[PDB]
Amino acid sequence: AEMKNLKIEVVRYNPEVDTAPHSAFYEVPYDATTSLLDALGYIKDNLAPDLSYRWSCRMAICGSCGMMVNNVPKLACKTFLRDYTDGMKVEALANFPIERDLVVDMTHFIESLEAIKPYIIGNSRTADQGTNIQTPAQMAKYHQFSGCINCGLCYAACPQFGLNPEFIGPAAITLAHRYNEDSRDHGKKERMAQLNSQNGVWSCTFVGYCSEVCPKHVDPAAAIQQGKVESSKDFLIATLKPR
Amino acid sequence: TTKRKPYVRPMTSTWWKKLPFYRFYMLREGTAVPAVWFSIELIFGLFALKNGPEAWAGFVDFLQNPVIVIINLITLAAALLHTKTWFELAPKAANIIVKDEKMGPEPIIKSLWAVTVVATIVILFVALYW
Amino acid sequence: MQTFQADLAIVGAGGAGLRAAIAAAQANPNAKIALISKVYPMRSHTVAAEGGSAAVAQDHDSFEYHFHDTVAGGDWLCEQDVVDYFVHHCPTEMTQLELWGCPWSRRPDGSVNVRRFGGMKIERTWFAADKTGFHMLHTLFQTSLQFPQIQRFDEHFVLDILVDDGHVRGLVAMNMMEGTLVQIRANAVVMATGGAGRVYRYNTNGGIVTGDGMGMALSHGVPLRDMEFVQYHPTGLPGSGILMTEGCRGEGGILVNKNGYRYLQDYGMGPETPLGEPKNKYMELGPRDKVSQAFWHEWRKGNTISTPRGDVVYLDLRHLGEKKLHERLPFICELAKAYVGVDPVKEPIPVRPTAHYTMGGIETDQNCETRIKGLFAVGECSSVGLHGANRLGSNSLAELVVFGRLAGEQATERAATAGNGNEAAIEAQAAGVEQRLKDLVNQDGGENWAKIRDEMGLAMEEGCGIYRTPELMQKTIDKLAELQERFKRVRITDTSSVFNTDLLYTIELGHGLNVAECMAHSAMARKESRGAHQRLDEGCTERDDVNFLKHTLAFRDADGTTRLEYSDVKITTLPPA
Amino acid sequence: MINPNPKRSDEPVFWGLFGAGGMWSAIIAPVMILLVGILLPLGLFPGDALSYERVLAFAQSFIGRVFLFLMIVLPLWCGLHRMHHAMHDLKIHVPAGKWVFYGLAAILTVVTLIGVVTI
């Protein structure tokens, strides 16, 4: 058969050579199964070997393909050319610094996740005692909030993170919340100061868009609001602690 | 001396016009304005009511102004909009497990609406039936 | 180069690498551990795993059953003292992960659940729902964050190790964003780089599983072991090769040809079982190899449905009904819907067998140590002796934490007792990498690496697949040597320094070529059939214990040749007959 | 990177008010706007229900005194907390906006209070 082509515009940017990013255009063949990631690789293979981008899994689970596509945050590996017959413009993930082409500086994200101490704290149980007991109900408290593949589509989507780059952000808050809600964790006190900050849950104005784009349906908006409730319980208790 | 020259795209105040999804959020947050305005009008009422039938009637004549009427329709439209989104947003603040699953908001939204419906009715009954 | 000094350096931040770091951090609170990874730790292929991790938990199970399943599953090419250590340590490590916060699926009583996998008689696979690898990885990554001993070198592509006088003294790596070279000095080094499934045109693996780590070991005279044993999975999507978990068939989906015939009862896996009631070892729950081979047979017969992406059988899950799909197999449903466009509810998923796991890898002793003192290997890039000719379903995740731990501690001891090496010699080594790198950049010729890549992938599928012949193995051997030549005539046109992937991808392709050669050579010389290595030629169609009960070892010399030696297989309590 | 000992935001306080206020305007504001803003001025009420004389009776009842207070006050807190943040989202710099908006809220709250203790 003959494969229909597609004129895709990718926004390029070399820091050695460029003053600002600028759009190039590539003609890519496709069928009904062709993902942006497929097409990115194709550009790179036969047209622009200097095309630099992140990826790995190809099944939207490593969380590495994140980029803007017609101004919406998406996983390239889960975005399909058939769905973009009118045009397709590919930019680096928004709200992050462009290092080079479609690669951006994830550091704040990374730094943010680290800041909330996402690990079991202060359970003393040891393996020789066997496992903690956690019931299907106990899990159901945090389970969804544990589905984060750390893509950062939330960060591109959040106008609040754009405006205030010190906002620790939807994912990071979600992840703190996930550990706080684990029956097996006893470390809530150690994550609260971050969330109680103005750079914590209190930067969110519930725009909600995060959760619209989560390719994993984590619903970080819900975790943040639940976090506001916890932050608010926290503040009150602090106010009543004269000791 | 790095060779990296990190390009930092600018975030302007027109940012929310872009995405239709952002527009709506601004709109939802717009309801605040007429909300505050209705609270204003109520204060005039509390006080024209205070200053006797003279003032109170000059108040009712105000509400009776054809433009104040239009503002107020809009005002109530805003309120319904607020009500509509409040009930969708509010439920995400709770984490209730029913039978080993995290409940969705739909049950809650239904209640907030039911209670809104009753309330709306009881007030109208009380306000008007006597 | 800027020089960093650490007690331990770990290459690779997947399950096995992270577990080695944490162990190393805990074995010594004072140590500086350099955890290196070309991608961020959470992007590693460990994240995509879905079936689960094996650890004896049930009252009726015994460590002798897990031990037995493993040796037999390995067709006896396993190192039985290694398998023994592994089964016994498995329960400890799945529990430790649970302690660390891993959300394993639970029973109503709140105890962890298990499910059947890999044809084992007694269920023993822990599963974090349908995302067991996601959970193991993120749990391990996140837990690693608490330990300040581990200093990660995220997105740093390791180019070579440094060995002087029979000992490893460090490594040279590229900061991928800065485009700069760095040199970490460490008296112990662990390679935890993953397998090599991307030397195949169609596979289930991330783009990053290119065998870089196995290549480096070849460079220094360490042989890769058992490379011809490459596991295929029976049910992968066409073209993409994306995995459809066995669980689809545990949940009782069926496999059928163009006539909707459940063809497997005719390949020894009869009789057919009722749609409701799936039996282990029978039909779709039959032996893995048999199912893949079955697909090949059906293909010869003209029973496979032809598609644009390729010939397929259908995986029919229609009789599971919407509810069943969601509670136990939601991801498959998204994957199917997205990548082939098939709502499993209304339709059958096209499936094809796909290259999947690397049984072979860097030869190590029982402590995960290699022939170079201080140099260690763990995970899919290695050969501990656990899997012989065929890994057990769900044994690879368990190994990562069992042996990742072992390696972390062992490396920590070796570091503690290393004592100093010859400095001039070490930096002479380091300059060697740098020099050799410039060579590859200046290298000229106008070969597009991508085509060599493509061409490699093709020769692997054709000549090193489910069934094997001496013609095709030779053709593949030959193709590959041609590709090695062409590789010297590749021009890397991008000269950028800031995340230059053209160059990194080109390095990985170079490792691939080396590795594939080991695989293709190992298989051609193995005149028998055992496990994953099945040959059609006269006098090679059966297992051969008189002659072939030994591991292939593949060395690569300075002259660019792939030489083989053979090692004996250790038996404790379980001989064959 | 991220401040180790970051200061507890005061934000829980306003947001609490705004929660109570928001729920109130959601449930009760529509019928109120309807009565006050639409029925009353259009004389679309039966008999003498919304007569000067009748209002006062309610206004001056204790229940009315509380009901009117909350009807006025709670929507301001929700309302103005929202406008406070709208400046930021719109990128409008207002000096001591926290002081401006919540100050305004407090002025009005007190006025309203004064009204429902009567003038």
Ligand SMILES: Cc1cc2nc3c(=O)[nH]c(=O)nc-3n(C[C@H](O)[C@H](O)[C@H](O)COP(=O)(O)OP(=O)(O)OC[C@H]3O[C@@H](n4cnc5c(N)ncnc54)[C@H](O)[C@@H]3O)c2cc1C
């Ligand atoms: C789709 C799929 C599903 C699977 N499901 C299961 C399952 O259900 N149960 C089971 O037991 N097994 C399963 N497996 C197999 C198992 O997951 C792998 O064998 C195992 O995860 C390998 O993990 P690892 O620690 O060896 O390394 P990997 O997870 O492969 O990570 C390797 C690391 O090496 C680093 N690296 C590589 N090259 C370099 C370099 N040059 N410089 C620096 N760093 C480098 C990468 O960045 C990465 O951090 C599955 C595999 C696939 C593909």
Ligand SMILES: O=C(O)/C=C/C(=O)O
């Ligand atoms: O989940 C699967 O089907 C694959 C299992 C495995 O590779 O161990």
Ligand code: F3S
């Ligand atoms: S978009 Fe931002 S405002 Fe909150 S709801 Fe999500 S973090």
Ligand code: FES
């Ligand atoms: S490549 Fe893993 S998220 Fe797309």
